[PDB]
Design a protein around this ligand. Sequence first.
Ligand SMILES: N#Cc1c(Cl)ncnc1Nc1ccc2c(c1)CC(=O)N2
Ligand SMILES: N#Cc1c(Cl)ncnc1Nc1ccc2c(c1)CC(=O)N2
Ligand SMILES: [Cl-]
Ligand SMILES: [Cl-]
Ligand SMILES: [Cl-]
Ligand SMILES: [Cl-]
Lengths: 4, 4, 124, 124
Amino acid sequence: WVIP
Amino acid sequence: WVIP
Amino acid sequence: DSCIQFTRHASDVLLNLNRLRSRDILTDVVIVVSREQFRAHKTVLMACSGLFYSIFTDQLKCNLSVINLDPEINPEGFCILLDFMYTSRLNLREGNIMAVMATAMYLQMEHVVDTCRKFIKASE
Amino acid sequence: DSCIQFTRHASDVLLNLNRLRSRDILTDVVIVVSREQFRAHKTVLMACSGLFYSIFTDQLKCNLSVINLDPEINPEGFCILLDFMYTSRLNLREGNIMAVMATAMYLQMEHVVDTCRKFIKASE
Ligand SMILES: N#Cc1c(Cl)ncnc1Nc1ccc2c(c1)CC(=O)N2
Ligand SMILES: N#Cc1c(Cl)ncnc1Nc1ccc2c(c1)CC(=O)N2
Ligand SMILES: [Cl-]
Ligand SMILES: [Cl-]
Ligand SMILES: [Cl-]
Ligand SMILES: [Cl-]
């Protein structure tokens, strides 16, 4: 999971 | 396009 | 093999599947979550959820145009997860995390359940 | 928005759509290319090809279960492009590049046409  |  | 790969292809396919959903193009099922209804593509639901994969591979249920979810399922939680299926983006907030996690457990979406557990553990 | 994103989601969706195709699950169209037939999902075809997007948004053609391509279309070229649609991987070889490029032009798959043009220009 990432900060888009 | 890339070499996968 | 000796194939070449187009990096953005999977993301572009998903973007188009979401555009079709927004325009209600070739949607083949309505998911009913208490008073709310959500139109979708059976194949996308199956590709994202262990529960839908099970339902639409069933010889009788594969032909249904309406699927009613358990009355304990929160419509907003379902909406957030349906958006995630079509975009890879999860709108996870303090006010919805419990509903999102419970819905992801029911839908059998392991990666969502995992990030919800991690965000909860960090706040305790 | 304040969303989080699952990097591998689009790739995982596409992998599952390909698995459904391989098992002939919820495929809703057969593409006929001379003596050969290819089963697929209308939504995936539309999401990858300007030609299929046009065909399946047509009020009459959207309901067809069989689509016959132009007799000039090479079945192997079509097979290579259908595999690309479901995997992001293009099996481009000296022996098939002309057929693949002509099929991609017909199907309106601009990124494939672009790499074929580049590979051809490099060999001249
Ligand atoms: N459609 C399809 C499909 C196929 Cl073909 N093969 C394997 N899994 C498929 N989908 C599916 C099954 C289980 C789970 C998910 C998706 C996400 C998750 O957390 N569990
Ligand atoms: N399905 C869908 C779709 C939608 Cl909803 N919006 C916009 N394009 C869509 N698909 C589509 C249209 C034109 C082209 C491609 C795909 C690849 C390409 O080279 N040209
Ligand atoms: Cl029904
Ligand atoms: Cl997931
Ligand atoms: Cl027909
Ligand atoms: Cl393309």
